[PDB]
């Protein structure tokens, strides 16, 4: 309940961010700045050096965790918006039910921004299953080997619609490259069926996570341990 006005602004940033899909660069930096500036105002106003400290700290702890996630190559992307969210909304109303939670929850530690990510990553684990159905409902069945694997991670449509939506060619039948990105690598095929990369941006699960975490908190970590 405390830091409400703040929370509402991160939510905006992420919904703009989750929807759009370059501007991902302007948003992250804006969140940090408004956040830091905002803390100054609240601090002097509320008269609590308490506020400012978590903020700066939050920005820092997050820079390190993502820069490391950046470096330990995995993170690849987004670690950045978790960064900015950090120096603004670290710490927000939220239930804890784990030993780790008592830890993630502390003085400087940006609890919510961090939590929003963890709960966010598990969500991404539903994705392949989301696409499994999108594909079922799309009236697509698999005829070959890699297709089954594909059924979970890719979406099948006609080269007409393929080019129409101008997507990344993933492969035909078993000629699948599960990591394609020669641009639209010569879409040279008949107006037939093809496999392509979907655009389900990990940004979403994190935004869903942003909104649900305040209600969920540590529960998922609990059940999964």
Swiss-Prot record:
Answer whether the UniProt record assigns the keyword Nucleotide-binding to this protein: no
Membrane topology for this entry? Multi-pass membrane protein
- Write the record's keywords in alphabetical order, separated by commas: Archaeal flagellum biogenesis, Cell membrane, Hydrolase, Membrane, Protease, Transmembrane, Transmembrane helix
Domain of life of the organism in this record? Answer: Archaea
Enzyme class, one word?
hydrolase
EC number(s) given by UniProt? 3.4.23.52
List the stretches on the Cytoplasmic face of the membrane: 4, 46-48, 89-109, 214-225
Gene Ontology terms, MF aspect: aspartic-type endopeptidase activity
- Listed name of the protein: Preflagellin peptidase
Gene name of the encoded protein:
flaK
